[PDB]
Amino acid sequence: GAETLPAEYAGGQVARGARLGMLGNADVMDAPFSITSYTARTIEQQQARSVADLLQANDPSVRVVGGRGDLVDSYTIRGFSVQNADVAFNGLYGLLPFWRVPIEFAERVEVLKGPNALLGGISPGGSVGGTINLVPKRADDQPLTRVSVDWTQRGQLGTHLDIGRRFGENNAFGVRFNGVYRNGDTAVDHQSREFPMLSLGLDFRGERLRLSSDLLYQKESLEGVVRPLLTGPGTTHIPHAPDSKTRFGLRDSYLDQEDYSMVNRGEYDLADNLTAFASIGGRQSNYETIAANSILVGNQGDIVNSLARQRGDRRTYSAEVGLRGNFDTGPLRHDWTLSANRLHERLGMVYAFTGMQSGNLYQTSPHTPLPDFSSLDGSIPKTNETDLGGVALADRLSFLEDRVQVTLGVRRQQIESRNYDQTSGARTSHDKRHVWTPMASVLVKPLQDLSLYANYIQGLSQGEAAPMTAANAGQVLAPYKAEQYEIGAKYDLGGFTTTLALFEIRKPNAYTDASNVFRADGEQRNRGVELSLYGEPLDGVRVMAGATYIKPEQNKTGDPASEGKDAPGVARRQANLGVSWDTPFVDGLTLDSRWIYTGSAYVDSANALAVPHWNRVDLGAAYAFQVAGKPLVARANLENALGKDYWTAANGYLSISSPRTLSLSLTADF
Ligand SMILES: O=C(O)[C@H]1CSC(c2ccccc2O)=N1
Ligand SMILES: O=C(O)[C@H]1CSC(c2ccccc2O)=N1
Ligand SMILES: [Fe+3]
Ligand SMILES: [K+]
């Protein structure tokens, strides 16, 4: 079953399989890629509210830029940036909240590392580091009436309902509802947040037919918006990170961000060896904000805050259609897939940058003036239109009793966009391109519990427009094609698994040359090693650990100051260690501890501005019991227990850490 939910692995904190785009779901041991899938059980035990909450705490390959006090999270994977807008939904792009994906309705959060253009086509944001994928909850046969209430520092009060039922003869239909409302002061100075959310997972199970519909509504409202710190022209050293409770940006900033979507999916078995599938979905996303980015000035901690208003109205549709089947050519079995997809978007995005206000890193800002931004009032004009569409064919060849598996495929990807001036309405650019893109993989199973593998696959990004100072100001460059080679090994001991991987990812870079011409003449070469252990090695001791090493080389630049240096915002070393322990001496009590480490990194391409390594420690506890015949669970989570302040590096800017943060919750099943 291509859409069959993979089972939980030993310990119940990760799953045994995950999605590979058009190929559907595959088991960890049958996948020639590094995949990880985190369960709803992990989400609930740790009290994780967003994708960033989950991945930062547990995964050694993923690091978050922005954070929960900002309006947006992005993610760094295998030394490249991954946009939140590029998070997939059962494989499909364009259907989840654009700036920050909430996960209290999710059954799984999967990470596939490296590019995967053949498997799912281009990402809307052009990300090539990896693909994160959410799986929605579904109604189980046993009905579910689950209520919890929660408290988060300093005054956020929340409630979450999770209710499921099935109906029709043979439980043919299912309905799962999730409702959340969390409101109050956050852990940062003079900030509050309000968050309502609604989701419905509906499904039908038939003899030859399976259908589902997912509906989601979400809104995040902030009074006070944290923003990055940018370098300046004369920055010579990065100052020490301030107390993470300080809020050094615009005092009276706000955000209102709303997203809602619907997607229908289906499968119909035409015969014992043929199946047709299709999906169609749409998303609306509305954005309103005034806030400011902080620019370093001098080198003792003084800043200038650069103010802006922004408004956004984004309309997206997303579709796929295909067939899957299987036939035997002697001692060779063919498992094949023919697939086509299509994304189309209309965007209105307006903005005005007015205001430069004095500040300081180590002081929470006073009320300052908000400039007159009424020139953006009224209807939001169209500024971009995008169309992405593709066709792909893939075939998995199995032989020697499935112990050798060779996968081949190719995809034709079309790209098109138009842009219009936000004040004038004038047509500015119209890009149209196509690219053919393939994959090849081979997996061998010398033992029933040991797999070895190698892959080759590509990533694609739309070309950038030249800056309006360069000689080719308006011109959009040709697409950037990344190429991955990977080899690895996976060893399942039954109770726990060890994996090892080595990869290389090469991708072109664009820079303004000596003659002031914008060109994709640069190249990046990221080579890395990945190690991980997860499972339940002793009864009642659950462990998730891992470590990565990457050399992110700027191997081709126009500048002797940057040639062969490291790409900015990529630490060479990263590690994570999580433990969860059912105490043998108290019935129903579980203790958790996590340690996250990020090594030193640079902010500039010349590597003149370094930022230090950092560590975060989390502590947790859960006590399960019964009242009047009902199961209940009380939980605590202390994030950043040691109260450390640290910068996360990116390309030309830094984002501040979150303060020590305690959350408490009580769950009951009725
Ligand atoms: O450049 C970007 O990526 C966007 C993300 S939101 C953003 C922003 C938002 C509010 C105020 C100022 C900003 O630069 N910048
Ligand atoms: O968020 C940032 O870093 C700044 C860089 S320029 C910038 C911007 C420029 C044009 C339009 C929107 C923007 O956010 N945002
Ligand atoms: Fe910006
Ligand atoms: K545009």
Side-chain angles (χ1 to χ4, degrees), residues 378-442:
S379 64
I380 300 163
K382 174 164 89 196
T383 59
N384 168 290
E385 303 194 79
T386 293
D387 223 295
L388 318 161
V391 180
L393 176 58
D395 186 15
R396 179 177 59 253
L397 311 184
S398 287
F399 36 105
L400 299 166
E401 304 134 66
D402 273 299
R403 307 275 294 276
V404 185
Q405 286 164 39
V406 177
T407 311
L408 301 166
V410 68
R411 170 179 297 271
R412 202 204 178 263
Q413 177 74 65
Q414 192 147 311
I415 301 167
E416 187 168 13
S417 60
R418 309 169 180 260
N419 298 270
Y420 310 84
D421 184 272
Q422 74 165 314
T423 291
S424 148
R427 292 181 180 85
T428 59
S429 59
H430 173 200
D431 203 14
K432 200 191 196 175
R433 316 263 183 181
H434 80 279
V435 178
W436 296 84
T437 185
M439 79 160 278
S441 78
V442 60

XYZ file of all heavy atoms in Angstrom, residues 378-442:
509
model
N -5.900 49.902 1.471
C -6.795 49.504 0.407
C -6.504 48.114 -0.128
O -5.915 47.250 0.529
N -6.961 47.899 -1.352
C -6.773 46.619 -2.006
C -5.295 46.376 -2.295
O -4.545 47.308 -2.609
C -7.576 46.584 -3.295
O -7.080 47.566 -4.186
N -4.879 45.116 -2.172
C -3.502 44.706 -2.436
C -3.395 44.342 -3.914
O -4.135 43.464 -4.373
C -3.095 43.518 -1.549
C -3.208 43.908 -0.067
C -1.682 43.074 -1.882
C -3.221 42.718 0.902
N -2.513 44.976 -4.684
C -2.402 44.650 -6.113
C -1.597 43.380 -6.365
O -0.701 43.013 -5.601
C -1.673 45.864 -6.693
C -0.807 46.340 -5.551
C -1.602 46.062 -4.282
N -1.913 42.725 -7.479
C -1.144 41.565 -7.899
C 0.286 41.964 -8.237
O 0.520 42.957 -8.930
C -1.794 40.899 -9.110
C -0.927 39.757 -9.690
C -1.719 38.843 -10.615
C -1.705 39.334 -12.054
N -2.781 38.663 -12.818
N 1.248 41.186 -7.744
C 2.654 41.429 -8.032
C 3.395 40.220 -8.593
O 4.478 40.416 -9.158
C 3.406 41.942 -6.776
O 3.322 40.986 -5.712
C 2.849 43.283 -6.298
N 2.872 38.994 -8.462
C 3.509 37.821 -9.069
C 2.463 36.768 -9.427
O 1.429 36.647 -8.761
C 4.575 37.217 -8.142
C 5.063 35.837 -8.609
O 4.321 34.845 -8.556
N 6.322 35.769 -9.056
N 2.738 36.022 -10.508
C 1.980 34.834 -10.903
C 2.951 33.719 -11.264
O 3.859 33.939 -12.066
C 1.101 35.073 -12.119
C 0.101 36.170 -12.026
C -0.903 36.067 -13.159
O -1.827 35.224 -13.052
O -0.739 36.797 -14.168
N 2.721 32.515 -10.736
C 3.669 31.413 -10.855
C 2.956 30.165 -11.346
O 1.851 29.856 -10.893
C 4.342 31.135 -9.505
O 5.176 32.247 -9.159
C 5.186 29.860 -9.552
N 3.587 29.444 -12.274
C 3.076 28.144 -12.690
C 4.223 27.144 -12.797
O 5.193 27.379 -13.528
C 2.314 28.243 -14.009
C 1.045 27.428 -13.980
O 1.128 26.186 -13.883
O -0.039 28.039 -14.012
N 4.108 26.046 -12.044
C 5.046 24.926 -12.069
C 4.284 23.669 -12.473
O 3.192 23.413 -11.954
C 5.696 24.722 -10.696
C 6.142 25.966 -9.922
C 6.314 25.660 -8.439
C 7.436 26.536 -10.506
N 4.841 22.893 -13.398
C 4.174 21.680 -13.841
C 5.161 20.693 -14.416
O 6.146 21.084 -15.051
N 4.893 19.397 -14.200
C 5.843 18.372 -14.607
C 5.220 17.014 -14.865
O 4.088 16.728 -14.455
N 5.986 16.168 -15.554
C 5.623 14.770 -15.774
C 6.835 13.911 -15.440
O 7.971 14.277 -15.764
C 5.159 14.523 -17.229
C 4.782 13.050 -17.445
C 3.993 15.476 -17.624
N 6.608 12.764 -14.805
C 7.715 11.910 -14.396
C 7.367 10.447 -14.604
O 6.199 10.047 -14.525
C 8.098 12.116 -12.919
N 8.412 9.649 -14.821
C 8.306 8.190 -14.886
C 9.425 7.582 -14.049
O 10.587 7.989 -14.176
C 8.396 7.697 -16.350
C 8.396 6.188 -16.622
C 7.145 5.506 -16.054
C 8.555 5.882 -18.127
N 9.089 6.603 -13.207
C 10.096 5.920 -12.401
C 9.812 4.419 -12.368
O 8.655 3.987 -12.446
C 10.142 6.490 -10.964
N 10.875 3.620 -12.238
C 10.732 2.163 -12.188
C 11.722 1.586 -11.190
O 12.919 1.888 -11.260
C 10.950 1.545 -13.581
C 10.675 0.032 -13.624
O 10.050 -0.514 -12.696
O 11.083 -0.626 -14.610
N 11.230 0.764 -10.258
C 12.091 0.039 -9.327
C 12.215 -1.426 -9.749
O 11.222 -2.165 -9.768
C 11.584 0.114 -7.886
C 12.480 -0.670 -6.911
C 12.066 -0.577 -5.434
N 10.711 -1.060 -5.197
C 9.678 -0.265 -4.934
N 9.856 1.052 -4.871
N 8.467 -0.779 -4.735
N 13.444 -1.847 -10.026
C 13.753 -3.203 -10.466
C 14.203 -4.031 -9.265
O 15.218 -3.713 -8.641
C 14.849 -3.177 -11.530
C 14.717 -2.212 -12.701
C 15.866 -2.414 -13.695
C 13.379 -2.423 -13.373
N 13.465 -5.091 -8.950
C 13.800 -5.975 -7.842
C 14.259 -7.311 -8.409
O 13.599 -7.873 -9.288
C 12.595 -6.186 -6.918
O 12.334 -5.036 -6.142
N 15.384 -7.823 -7.917
C 15.790 -9.158 -8.331
C 16.516 -9.861 -7.194
O 16.745 -9.293 -6.113
C 16.637 -9.136 -9.614
C 17.562 -7.956 -9.736
C 18.927 -8.105 -9.520
C 17.076 -6.710 -10.121
C 19.789 -7.022 -9.650
C 17.924 -5.624 -10.251
C 19.283 -5.776 -10.017
N 16.836 -11.134 -7.451
C 17.487 -12.011 -6.483
C 16.731 -12.016 -5.159
O 17.285 -11.740 -4.089
C 18.956 -11.623 -6.295
C 19.780 -11.719 -7.577
C 21.131 -11.019 -7.443
C 19.963 -13.184 -7.969
N 15.430 -12.305 -5.254
C 14.536 -12.367 -4.100
C 14.533 -11.054 -3.316
O 14.644 -11.037 -2.085
C 14.906 -13.553 -3.199
C 14.914 -14.885 -3.942
C 16.142 -15.720 -3.644
O 16.297 -16.169 -2.485
O 16.954 -15.926 -4.573
N 14.432 -9.939 -4.044
C 14.308 -8.602 -3.472
C 15.542 -8.149 -2.695
O 15.483 -7.123 -2.004
C 13.082 -8.504 -2.557
C 11.826 -8.140 -3.309
O 11.795 -7.051 -3.922
O 10.870 -8.943 -3.290
N 16.659 -8.877 -2.780
C 17.870 -8.498 -2.067
C 18.725 -7.503 -2.834
O 19.691 -6.992 -2.268
C 18.725 -9.738 -1.742
C 18.009 -10.882 -1.006
C 18.001 -10.678 0.502
N 19.344 -10.740 1.077
C 19.977 -11.865 1.415
N 19.388 -13.044 1.247
N 21.207 -11.810 1.919
N 18.434 -7.256 -4.108
C 19.056 -6.185 -4.880
C 17.937 -5.383 -5.539
O 17.062 -5.958 -6.195
C 20.054 -6.727 -5.928
C 20.775 -5.586 -6.634
C 21.073 -7.637 -5.268
N 17.945 -4.062 -5.327
C 16.897 -3.150 -5.797
C 17.552 -1.971 -6.499
O 18.320 -1.224 -5.877
C 16.022 -2.630 -4.639
C 15.018 -3.632 -4.051
C 14.483 -3.193 -2.686
O 14.228 -2.005 -2.449
N 14.342 -4.149 -1.774
N 17.235 -1.795 -7.779
C 17.764 -0.720 -8.611
C 16.585 0.156 -9.034
O 15.616 -0.348 -9.620
C 18.516 -1.262 -9.844
C 18.994 -0.124 -10.742
C 19.700 -2.151 -9.433
N 16.667 1.460 -8.743
C 15.600 2.410 -9.055
C 16.087 3.455 -10.052
O 17.123 4.093 -9.831
C 15.082 3.129 -7.792
O 14.809 2.182 -6.754
C 13.810 3.913 -8.105
N 15.312 3.663 -11.125
C 15.632 4.651 -12.154
C 14.411 5.526 -12.438
O 13.268 5.086 -12.293
C 16.118 3.962 -13.458
C 17.359 3.048 -13.398
C 17.522 2.192 -14.657
C 18.621 3.842 -13.185
N 14.648 6.777 -12.832
C 13.531 7.648 -13.171
C 13.983 8.944 -13.801
O 15.125 9.382 -13.627
N 13.063 9.570 -14.528
C 13.338 10.882 -15.098
C 12.059 11.713 -15.070
O 10.942 11.179 -15.130
C 13.907 10.771 -16.537
C 12.844 10.251 -17.480
C 14.459 12.108 -17.011
N 12.235 13.035 -14.950
C 11.134 13.992 -14.828
C 11.401 15.178 -15.745
O 12.538 15.658 -15.833
C 10.977 14.467 -13.364
C 10.020 15.650 -13.135
C 9.916 16.031 -11.636
N 9.353 14.955 -10.805
C 8.051 14.792 -10.567
N 7.164 15.633 -11.084
N 7.626 13.795 -9.798
N 10.366 15.650 -16.433
C 10.448 16.927 -17.148
C 9.726 18.007 -16.345
O 8.505 17.925 -16.159
C 9.854 16.822 -18.557
C 10.376 17.908 -19.521
C 9.407 18.163 -20.669
N 9.845 19.216 -21.596
C 9.443 20.488 -21.549
N 8.596 20.902 -20.608
N 9.891 21.357 -22.446
N 10.467 19.032 -15.905
C 9.948 20.075 -15.006
C 9.845 21.414 -15.736
O 10.865 21.960 -16.170
C 10.846 20.240 -13.774
C 10.429 21.374 -12.782
C 9.195 21.000 -11.964
O 9.236 20.067 -11.156
N 8.092 21.708 -12.181
N 8.631 21.963 -15.829
C 8.436 23.301 -16.383
C 8.272 24.354 -15.282
O 7.673 24.108 -14.232
C 7.229 23.345 -17.320
C 7.156 24.635 -18.141
C 6.553 24.416 -19.514
O 6.949 23.504 -20.242
N 5.586 25.250 -19.874
N 8.812 25.543 -15.549
C 8.808 26.679 -14.632
C 8.345 27.919 -15.397
O 8.800 28.155 -16.523
C 10.212 26.919 -14.049
C 10.717 25.683 -13.308
C 10.225 28.167 -13.171
C 12.195 25.737 -12.982
N 7.455 28.715 -14.793
C 7.032 29.976 -15.403
C 6.569 30.966 -14.330
O 5.918 30.574 -13.360
C 5.910 29.765 -16.433
C 5.560 31.046 -17.217
C 4.663 30.823 -18.426
O 4.074 29.735 -18.567
O 4.559 31.750 -19.260
N 6.896 32.250 -14.514
C 6.434 33.299 -13.611
C 6.409 34.642 -14.331
O 7.177 34.862 -15.274
C 7.318 33.409 -12.376
O 8.649 33.721 -12.738
N 5.526 35.543 -13.844
C 5.431 36.937 -14.260
C 5.407 37.831 -13.029
O 4.834 37.468 -11.997
C 4.162 37.207 -15.087
C 3.981 36.242 -16.244
C 2.597 36.327 -16.898
N 2.487 35.369 -18.007
C 2.620 35.693 -19.290
N 2.855 36.955 -19.628
N 2.511 34.762 -20.236
N 6.013 39.015 -13.147
C 6.052 39.976 -12.052
C 5.632 41.356 -12.540
O 5.817 41.711 -13.710
C 7.451 40.022 -11.404
C 7.848 38.673 -10.795
O 7.570 38.403 -9.624
N 8.470 37.812 -11.601
N 5.051 42.126 -11.622
C 4.498 43.444 -11.896
C 4.939 44.419 -10.809
O 5.028 44.058 -9.630
C 2.960 43.381 -11.967
C 2.448 42.282 -12.879
C 2.317 40.971 -12.419
C 2.115 42.550 -14.209
C 1.862 39.960 -13.253
C 1.652 41.541 -15.053
C 1.535 40.251 -14.576
O 1.086 39.245 -15.417
N 5.210 45.659 -11.203
C 5.673 46.648 -10.237
C 4.577 46.959 -9.224
O 3.408 47.131 -9.590
C 6.113 47.918 -10.954
C 6.685 48.940 -10.003
O 5.902 49.742 -9.458
O 7.909 48.924 -9.783
N 4.954 47.026 -7.943
C 3.957 47.179 -6.885
C 3.317 48.573 -6.859
O 2.193 48.718 -6.368
C 4.583 46.882 -5.526
C 5.507 47.977 -5.018
C 5.803 47.821 -3.542
O 4.891 47.588 -2.743
N 7.069 47.960 -3.166
N 3.998 49.607 -7.351
C 3.403 50.945 -7.351
C 2.768 51.300 -8.683
O 1.712 51.950 -8.716
C 4.460 52.004 -7.002
O 4.836 51.869 -5.625
C 3.933 53.421 -7.233
N 3.366 50.816 -9.767
C 3.040 51.189 -11.130
C 2.195 50.171 -11.880
O 1.512 50.542 -12.842
C 4.348 51.407 -11.891
O 4.182 51.047 -13.229
N 2.254 48.893 -11.506
C 1.563 47.866 -12.252
C 2.255 47.435 -13.525
O 1.732 46.566 -14.229
N 3.413 48.007 -13.834
C 4.128 47.705 -15.063
C 4.635 46.264 -15.065
O 5.034 45.730 -14.025
C 5.306 48.665 -15.205
N 4.626 45.630 -16.240
C 5.208 44.295 -16.363
C 6.724 44.392 -16.278
O 7.340 45.167 -17.014
C 4.807 43.641 -17.685
C 3.334 43.280 -17.795
C 3.058 42.617 -19.148
N 1.651 42.266 -19.280
C 0.720 43.111 -19.701
N 1.060 44.351 -20.037
N -0.547 42.721 -19.788
N 7.335 43.618 -15.380
C 8.777 43.722 -15.187
C 9.545 42.508 -15.693
O 10.559 42.684 -16.375
C 9.115 43.981 -13.706
O 8.606 42.916 -12.892
C 8.550 45.356 -13.241
N 9.105 41.282 -15.380
C 9.783 40.078 -15.849
C 8.769 38.994 -16.209
O 7.621 39.003 -15.752
C 10.780 39.538 -14.807
O 10.128 39.234 -13.582
N 9.216 38.057 -17.062
C 8.416 36.898 -17.460
C 9.383 35.767 -17.816
O 9.863 35.697 -18.951
C 7.497 37.216 -18.631
C 6.789 36.015 -19.181
N 6.250 35.978 -20.449
C 6.528 34.804 -18.628
C 5.680 34.803 -20.653
N 5.829 34.074 -19.560
N 9.636 34.887 -16.853
C 10.541 33.751 -16.992
C 9.778 32.504 -17.431
O 8.663 32.249 -16.967
C 11.242 33.501 -15.652
C 12.555 32.745 -15.796
O 13.077 32.638 -16.926
O 13.066 32.258 -14.762
N 10.377 31.729 -18.337
C 9.803 30.446 -18.741
C 10.933 29.495 -19.101
O 11.737 29.814 -19.980
C 8.858 30.617 -19.923
C 7.885 29.475 -20.108
C 7.160 29.592 -21.441
C 5.918 28.716 -21.479
N 5.153 28.921 -22.737
N 10.991 28.337 -18.430
C 12.082 27.379 -18.577
C 11.550 25.953 -18.455
O 10.463 25.716 -17.916
C 13.174 27.585 -17.512
C 13.579 29.024 -17.247
C 14.831 29.385 -18.019
N 15.276 30.743 -17.718
C 16.338 31.322 -18.275
N 17.065 30.649 -19.162
N 16.672 32.571 -17.949
N 12.340 24.997 -18.947
C 12.136 23.585 -18.635
C 13.487 22.929 -18.392
O 14.516 23.396 -18.888
C 11.371 22.827 -19.738
C 12.225 22.437 -20.900
N 12.554 23.320 -21.907
C 12.809 21.258 -21.225
C 13.314 22.705 -22.796
N 13.489 21.455 -22.402
N 13.476 21.862 -17.589
C 14.670 21.080 -17.257
C 14.264 19.615 -17.134
O 13.264 19.307 -16.481
C 15.330 21.531 -15.934
C 16.545 20.652 -15.613
C 15.717 23.008 -15.960
N 15.037 18.714 -17.754
C 14.947 17.278 -17.486
C 15.839 16.910 -16.301
O 16.985 17.361 -16.216
C 15.378 16.463 -18.717
C 14.493 16.627 -19.914
C 14.551 17.627 -20.852
C 13.421 15.766 -20.313
N 13.575 17.445 -21.801
C 12.862 16.315 -21.493
C 12.872 14.587 -19.785
C 11.780 15.726 -22.155
C 11.787 13.999 -20.441
C 11.256 14.572 -21.616
N 15.320 16.074 -15.391
C 16.082 15.735 -14.161
C 15.873 14.280 -13.724
O 14.713 13.824 -13.620
C 15.699 16.730 -13.034
O 16.504 16.505 -11.868
C 14.211 16.634 -12.652
N 16.980 13.482 -13.508
C 16.816 12.043 -13.222
C 17.277 11.592 -11.833
O 17.773 12.393 -11.034
C 17.706 11.403 -14.287
C 18.926 12.334 -14.263
C 18.373 13.757 -13.910
N 17.130 10.294 -11.550
C 17.739 9.644 -10.392
C 18.157 8.226 -10.768
O 17.698 7.657 -11.767
C 16.804 9.591 -9.179
C 15.752 8.486 -9.241
S 15.056 8.071 -7.604
C 16.304 6.958 -6.958
N 19.069 7.686 -9.957
C 19.526 6.305 -10.018
C 19.901 5.895 -8.608
O 20.590 6.640 -7.909
C 20.745 6.136 -10.936
N 19.465 4.712 -8.199
C 19.822 4.215 -6.886
C 19.951 2.700 -6.972
O 19.404 2.058 -7.886
C 18.795 4.646 -5.832
O 17.629 3.842 -5.916
N 20.717 2.148 -6.030
C 20.880 0.698 -5.870
C 21.021 0.410 -4.381
O 21.795 1.073 -3.680
C 22.087 0.130 -6.650
C 23.382 0.762 -6.204
C 22.175 -1.377 -6.452
